[PDB]
């Protein structure tokens, strides 16, 4: 039946494609042409519609496609843009859950993680070959992403930017397949140049390529490598930035058989190079990750936990920590008698001194071509290859020697965190988009106003991973409706993992050990 595609597709063309993939193709072709007209985009490539009608996927997508022949092989790099359609329902999957002696099945919709199967990709490749004529071409996966059903398609600015970013990545991957030279400390280490860095206690969120908010408590900014006394580059003005890492810190309530009860879980939510640089490679990513390490290694992250004193509406007010402590009460942090010293004491008794470094990993994110190696490095059939790629990336940064710090085959680079991440946003009182991750441990304690039993039910939902994830997802959504509100939109899900402490030691020390010295701007607190 599915093998009749061999007859169905032999000749001719048809009238088809869903309403969103149709509209999306039309706007993306318009944007391509305007970008060429304004000379922002080069006219060396093609945009294609992938149909659920003409070919074998549940979800249609547009394909950002670039090509070159590399050493005789035709190579195509594709960055799919999934187009979910609110009016189209793909048949659901049966989730059978063996609840001890009780067996029950939950049916559920396929998300981009379930949709982007290995065959989904292979079908994308085949269609491109039909559309490009390159039937013997190899196709590079730049990472599928999704442009969600919900918003109006008239945002030409964002859509233009999506094409721009997607072609950037396509050029990188053709280049890196072509053998292009890597990013390294040697390029930064001018004989007359040094690095410096600071922690930004932002007070604001940051936004992905489609404009959705990303939680961050601290933005780590690594300054441009340079030195006073160097030749000024004519009449210029520039931001002195090299890269940045977005992160936040939760306070996880963790077991112990003497440590205090909460863990300073430092979570990377995003990794970006400064906007003036176009390329996106593993070496650039890996180098930037050292920015999160310094958050607790040299500086002190705990300043981010200070309550917004004077602000009534602080949903994550530290005062909530008193509900997990022996007080079983909110600390009065509204008062003129609440001091910096009292804050430090709450933490002395409640929060552990040893930082833990972890990060999100998203196969469908803005950095998916790279996120995918870090995800496969967690485990599975190609873990060894993904790990080899990552250690090679750091060695490219330092000129070898990562191996002088530890054995990557005894110490895999990233461990699973188990509980995965539901992403989404909610609207605040003025209708702005805010990250749903705000109901973190302090957030949830204030949301239940001290009802510890309600908190613990939620907390167990977010921690006990012997419970099938569908059951956990349903309870997590039930809790958002009661505590966050009904104005909640869900977005593409993601993985989380723990960076191996030895990977971290080797990355940070190896860079410092080759002379790429970085000064702290916050010289003392």
């Amino acid at each position: 039946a599915g093998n009749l595609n061999s007859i169905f597709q032999r000749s001719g063309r048809t009238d088809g494609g869903d309403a969103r993939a149709s509209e999306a193709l039309a706007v993306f072709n318009k944007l391509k042409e305007e970008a060429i007209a304004q000379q922002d985009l080069h006219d060396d490539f093609l945009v294609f519609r992938f149909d659920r009608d003409q070919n074998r996927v549940g979800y249609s997508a547009l394909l950002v496609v670039k090509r070159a022949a590399i050493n005789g092989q035709q190579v195509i790099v594709t960055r799919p843009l999934v187009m979910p359609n609110d009016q189209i329902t793909l048949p659901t999957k049966k989730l059978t859950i063996q609840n001890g002696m009780h067996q029950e099945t939950i049916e559920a919709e396929a998300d981009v993680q379930d949709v982007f199967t290995t065959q989904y990709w292979n079908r994308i490749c085949d269609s491109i070959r039909q559309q490009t004529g390159k039937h013997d071409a190899m196709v590079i996966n730049a990472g599928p992403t999704v442009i969600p059903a919900d918003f109006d398609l008239k945002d030409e600015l964002v859509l233009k930017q999506l094409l721009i970013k997607s072609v950037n990545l396509c050029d990188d991957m053709l280049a890196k397949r072509s053998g292009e030279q890597p990013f390294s400390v040697a390029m930064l280490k001018g004989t007359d140049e040094t690095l410096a860095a600071r922690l930004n206690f932002t007070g604001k969120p940051m936004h992905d390529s489609l404009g959705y908010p990303i939680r961050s408590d601290i933005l780590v900014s690594l300054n441009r490598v340079k030195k006073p006394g160097q030749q000024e580059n004519e009449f210029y003005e520039a931001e002195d930035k090299l890269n940045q890492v977005s992160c936040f810190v939760n306070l996880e309530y963790t077991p112990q058989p003497q440590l205090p009860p909460l863990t300073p879980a430092i979570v990377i939510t995003d990794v970006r190079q400064a906007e003036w640089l176009k390329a996106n490679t593993m070496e650039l990513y890996l180098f930037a990750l050292s920015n999160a390490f310094r958050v607790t290694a040299n500086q002190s992250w705990a300043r981010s936990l200070l309550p917004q004193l004077g602000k009534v509406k602080d949903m994550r007010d530290i005062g909530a920590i008193g509900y997990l402590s022996r007080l079983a009460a909110r600390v009065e942090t509204k008062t003129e008698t609440f001091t910096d010293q009292n804050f430090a004491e709450l933490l002395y008794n409640m929060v552990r001194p040893s930082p833990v470094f972890m990060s999100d990993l998203n196969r469908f994110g803005d950095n998916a071509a790279i996120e995918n190696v870090f995800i496969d490095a967690l485990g599975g059939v190609n873990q060894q290859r993904a790990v080899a790629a990552i250690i090679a990336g750091v060695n490219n940064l330092i000129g070898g020697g990562f191996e002088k710090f530890f054995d990557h085959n005894t110490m895999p680079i990233i461990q699973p965190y188990g509980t995965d991440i539901q992403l989404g946003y909610y609207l605040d009182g003025e209708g702005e988009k805010q990250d749903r991750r705000d109901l973190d441990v302090l957030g949830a304690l204030n949301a239940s106003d001290g009802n510890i039993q309600e908190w613990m039910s939620w907390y167990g939902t977010q921690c006990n991973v012997a419970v099938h994830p569908e059951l956990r997802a349903r309870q997590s959504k039930n809790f958002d409706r009661q505590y966050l509100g009904n104005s909640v939109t869900y977005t593409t899900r993601a993985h989380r993992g723990i960076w191996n402490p030895k990977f971290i030691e080797a990355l940070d020390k190896a860079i410092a050990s080759v002379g790429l010295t970085v000064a702290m701007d916050n010289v003392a607190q």
Binding site: T118, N141, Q383
Partner: peptide, 12 residues
């Protein structure tokens, strides 16, 4: 508990 792998490329 298990890790699925999609069709990644370039690095392998």
């Amino acid at each position: 508990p298990q890790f699925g792998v999609g069709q990644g490329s370039g690095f392998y």
